[PDB]
């Protein structure tokens, strides 16, 4: 799970890498960055990563009631 952050102040970019499994919960950064709301939903939709604390986690790309996580 990869987080690309931008700092407009210092004109700098940084990356955060963390790991996960098919059943291991991952903290949600939606409380910190409200712009991560949809990106976490897309990550779950196509991989199946358990984002704990997400206000509304659900499918965003695949069909309704779609079985499987395509990007695995």
């Amino acid at each position: 799970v990869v987080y690309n952050l931008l700092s407009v102040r210092h004109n700098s970019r940084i990356r955060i890498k963390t790991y996960a499994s098919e059943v291991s919960p991952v903290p949600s950064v939606v409380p910190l960055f409200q712009g991560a709301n949809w990106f976490e939903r897309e990550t779950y939709d196509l991989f199946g990563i358990f984002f704990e604390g997400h206000p509304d986690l659900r499918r965003i790309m695949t069909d309704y009631g779609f079985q499987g996580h395509p990007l695995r």
Partner: protein, 115 residues
């Protein structure tokens, strides 16, 4: 921003007793909204049949032991519930959900090329 209707915050439950209560509460919500599913999706079956179908899906995962699998199963069961109540699923998808269902012998499969 605000979450959509019937949305639950995702939480990793670490207690099997607390997980069991959350599953039973959700199972009741499926039963209560069964008449709503027949109304919105214009099903050709009574709500009594819908409640029977709900119980079968809950009975499939009756004997799942691992806690991490329980949370993922519970989380996916909540997402499906939010999908059905809010009428996000198209009516064709719900109709086919009730369309689901004796195996042939060796020779019978042999004659037709088997699987």
């Amino acid at each position: 921003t605000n979450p959509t209707a019937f949305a639950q915050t995702t939480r990793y439950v670490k207690d099997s007793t607390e997980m069991r209560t959350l599953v039973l509460n959700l199972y009741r919500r499926y039963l209560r909204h069964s008449r709503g599913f027949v109304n919105n999706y214009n099903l050709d079956i009574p709500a009594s049949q819908v409640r029977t179908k709900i119980r079968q899906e809950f009975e499939r995962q009756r004997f799942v032991k691992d806690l991490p699998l329980k949370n993922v199963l519970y989380m996916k069961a909540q997402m499906e519930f939010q999908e059905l109540v809010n009428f996000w699923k198209q009516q064709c998808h719900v109709m086919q959900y009730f369309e689901s269902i004796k195996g042939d012998s060796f020779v019978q499969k042999f004659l037709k090329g088997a699987q």
